[PDB]
Amino acid sequence: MGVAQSPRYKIIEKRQSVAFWCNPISGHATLYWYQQILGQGPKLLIQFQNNGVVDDSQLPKDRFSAERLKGVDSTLKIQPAKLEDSAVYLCASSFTWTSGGATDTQYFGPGTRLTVLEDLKNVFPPEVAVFEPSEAEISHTQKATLVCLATGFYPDHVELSWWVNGKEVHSGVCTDPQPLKEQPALNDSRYALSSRLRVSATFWQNPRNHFRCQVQFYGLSENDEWTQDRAKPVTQIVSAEAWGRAD
Amino acid sequence: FLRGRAYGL
Amino acid sequence: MIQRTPKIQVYSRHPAENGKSNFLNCYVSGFHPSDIEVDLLKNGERIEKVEHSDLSFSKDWSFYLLYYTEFTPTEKDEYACRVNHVTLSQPKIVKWDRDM
Amino acid sequence: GSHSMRYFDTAMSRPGRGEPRFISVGYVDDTQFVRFDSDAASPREEPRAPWIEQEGPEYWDRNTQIFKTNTQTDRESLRNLRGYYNQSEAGSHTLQSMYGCDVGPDGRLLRGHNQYAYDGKDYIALNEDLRSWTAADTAAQITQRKWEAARVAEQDRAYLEGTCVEWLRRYLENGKDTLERADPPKTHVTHHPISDHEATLRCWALGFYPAEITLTWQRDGEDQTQDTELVETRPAGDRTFQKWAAVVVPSGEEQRYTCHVQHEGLPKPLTLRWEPS
Amino acid sequence: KITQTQPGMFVQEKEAVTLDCTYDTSDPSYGLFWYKQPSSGEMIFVIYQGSYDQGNATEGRYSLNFQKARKSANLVISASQLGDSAMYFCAMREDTGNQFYFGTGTSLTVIPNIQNPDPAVYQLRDSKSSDKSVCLFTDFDSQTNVSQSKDSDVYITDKCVLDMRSMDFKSNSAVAWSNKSDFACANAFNNSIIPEDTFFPS
Ligand SMILES: [Cl-]
Ligand SMILES: [Cl-]
Ligand SMILES: [Cl-]
Ligand SMILES: [Cl-]
Ligand SMILES: [Cl-]
Ligand SMILES: [Cl-]
Ligand code: NA
Ligand code: NA
Ligand code: NA
Ligand code: NA
Ligand code: NA
Ligand code: NA
Predict the structure, then answer these.
(1) Which among A91, A118, A145 is the end of a domain?
(2) Topology: which residues are Extracellular (chain D)?
(3) What is the CATH number of domain C1-100?
(4) Which residues are near ligand 3, the ion (C-beta closer than 5 Å)?
């Protein structure tokens, strides 16, 4: 269960429209939509009790709308999107909203990250390279740090993850909280993001161990128009790999 | 202060 | 009980003293369902501008109303309360009686 | 002293006549303080007590929101109810709810109420423990199941133990001059000759608050009841109450008859007799 | 109105933190809610306090220091882990109000008690494709802050905490890179205050 939402990321050109879907905790009568601008907390857009509105005073007049036709499933829509709409759209559900007790507490979904761009032609997939650990690091600390560099991607719609022998690895990992503007001058600047997987010296030196660095990019879809020379920057997995080194 | 009824009979 | 007949009481706010200003009440109560028509009558003619409490109900679920009006009781002015409800095949009229 | 806050709610469908009638009136003890009614009834000229008016327009907007919101639920309630009882769309039906909290002298909860009636017959009630329901019949059992699955008792317990209590205190503080008064009954006995043989003695209690009162006739001290004709306690219309007790007595025997009033605002239970003035 | 001041907030591992939050209500009855938002910004509900409940609210390592008269509802995180960062949001639900009022949010970074610093700047040779060369300034201690470079074509990240859980080991790390030919690991962090005992292998 949990509050479900779709999609996780979406790129829209200015003036286009978006839909956001949300599925409340099964049986929750109340459903809220929030907008979260970068740097702020969530601010209520609209609230539903079963299939009816409780409050929508903060629904941006005539760009934003929302239905919950059958008091379950709900949908948030933005028709003409402005750049200012770039934000995370969280929905949340609860049993009640004025009980004045615990059943008021709101459980949020994963949220949808919306990025509204001036032109879709500025969207780039990441290029990702693995960097093998330095020899000195092995013969000094008895452990090997692989470094992953995901580069030249835009917008900031990526999730980097390490894969050791077909298994996504929880621990010994370090991804930057924030990307780097590869050319701080330009407004729409492509991004860089580094990550570290430190394993033991033993584990790295075995050449039957497979270290794969994976970047999930969320970009354009099949339905997005695209006229550039390079291929359309679709949602895709760009990944780099390395084997263990005996040395 | 009124009470809220979120769940019908 | 889907249907309950109204209890009507017609009385004054203060004990009636001929010539002194008062309020005439018609308390209509214990009825169900809610639809009801109440009129205060002075010598048979309907008293225009009567104030009333709006529909509420008791712990037994039966609804109640108070229809009241300002009035100066006189020796031979005859007040009454006409009430119509689904339980009444015809409008019930209760004469005001000072002693009650 | 001790107090009660209660709300009385109604939703009456009116097929082919208009939209359902939705009413919600609140009382602290025997004082109406707030009324919401889908049938508007004047430009928000809606019977608010002065000490509610002092609460902001935010209080008022919010309670209005909850009301409109409640009507919405209650429409769903009506629909489901006639499904449970296989009733056609054609009939008019009434849903009623009664809820609120009884606080002690120390402003803490004694009892929480929350019960429902359909077409003037009890349907479902929140038990005293505020954790369970009694269903009046098979139809109400569907409601009960639906409500235990959806944890409604918990939502209602929260209102009754939290919001109800806390606001009732806020109300009792702000309206102390009104709400804490106990107006004693102004009493008297009148004589009403029926014949040469008999006469009605009428024992009156006027202007009292709260409505709780006891009017009893007695003979030499020995109680009646079978012969005492009570009338239903009734509003004066000035936020005060009236009741009278009558008994028929053989002429000459008036002094043998005693009226016994008993009221909250009366220091000691009073005795009256007829007195030819 | 919620006011959680402090731009950010730091704490040692295994230590306890207080995240300040002062509300403004005037209502007789209301509720207070704390929510945490990690990277990958999901809103996780942590703790609830009703203005009327008797004992203060406790939930696991989370605790609400609710002071009605001073109108403050500080969140108390005890025995802090690394996974406690996380931006934290304070929210008030007041009977009279029409929404959860969320604060601007306080970010809490949890510093690891770095347990034997051997500062090093290693040079990671490529796997294959990428004209870059990557420097890893690693194993340093919590007292050192990494500055991003003053030169156009050199990118330097920011201290990031590795957790090797299995081996109890925790490691601070920072990465730098460039395409420019005059870039070696020696001068990579010449804009940062690196420890005097920083190892530099050739
Ligand atoms: Cl539905
Ligand atoms: Cl009228
Ligand atoms: Cl009508
Ligand atoms: Cl309808
Ligand atoms: Cl009407
Ligand atoms: Cl305090
Ligand atoms: Na699409
Ligand atoms: Na009857
Ligand atoms: Na009229
Ligand atoms: Na009473
Ligand atoms: Na009575
Ligand atoms: Na203190």
Answers:
(1) A118
(2) 1-277
(3) 2.60.40.10
(4) D 17
